[PDB]
């Protein structure tokens with residue numbers, strides 16, 4: 001029913017990852033909403049359930065596969081399927097709880113985690129912050145195996161949480177931000193794993209705020225500046241959508257566009 005995009009970490013290259021992220025973005029956005037050259041994700045209000053999700057099938061060199069489900073309104077990873085079992089994060093509201101009942105309906109074992117899927121909760125369970133969790137093709141390869149083996153008891157909860165953190169950043173954050181996609185491309189190009197620097201972290205943390213500031217802006221001009229960080233941790237201010245056009249690939253819907 002829902003569209004499926006395939007990616008493998010097995011022999012992954014800059015080009016194959018680029019093709020993957022492009023395809024994810026294409027399935028997330030309809031083209032109906034572009035503001036200051038930046039696409040906006042579908043509005044959740046009145047969005048039919050048959051259009052609510054996309055599926056990301058991740059394969060690895062170990063010949064294992066897992067399927068992530070992403071909410072098109074925000075690119076949120078709501079859960080995953082591995083073989084005969086599916087696992088969903090504790091839904092944030094009743095609407096999102098109803099929505100996940102439409103996912104992996106043929107699966108033998110359905111589970112909802114007692115914990116939500118936001119970074120703060122996942123970092124708590126992992127026993128590590130995003131700033132200390134390595135990203136790259138190797139981490140993703142390993143994350144796929146960890147998600148696959150969870151149902152059989154091979155994967156400890158901190159490892160599972162860490163693995164979610166890897167997947168979310170390398171798929172959802174990369175889809176949201178050309179900048180983060182670029183950072184992942186670099187890791188893949190040189191096959192060098194590394195934790196995300198402050199520029200990546202602050203962009204992730206600011207996605208909602210940046211989306212709102214752009215959409216509420218006066219002809220692109222922010223009413224209030226937004227503070228981001230450089231690679232070295234130094235602060236720089238964003239006053240305008242213009243500087244964000246090469247940085248942000250997708251925005252969450254926050255308000256109606258002005259006439």
Ligand SMILES: Nc1nc2nc(C(=O)N[C@@H](CCc3ccccc3)C(=O)O)cnc2c(=O)[nH]1
Pocket residue numbers: 074075076077078089117118119120168172173204205206207208
């Ligand atoms: N399962 C899952 N968890 C996610 N968690 C976050 C996350 O917690 N992000 C930031 C900013 C707030 C935010 C931004 C976008 C979506 C939700 C929440 C933070 O609070 O540090 C971000 N994205 C996702 C995601 O795509 N899948």
Ligand SMILES: Nc1nc2nc(C(=O)N[C@@H](CCc3ccccc3)C(=O)O)cnc2c(=O)[nH]1
Pocket residue numbers: 071073074076078089090091092093096116117118207208209252
């Ligand atoms: N399907 C699903 N979606 C979820 N989305 C979020 C979440 O924080 N979503 C926000 C993300 C964008 C945002 C806006 C304003 C400030 C920060 C971040 C949204 O869609 O407005 C949390 N949890 C869930 C969840 O459990 N299931």
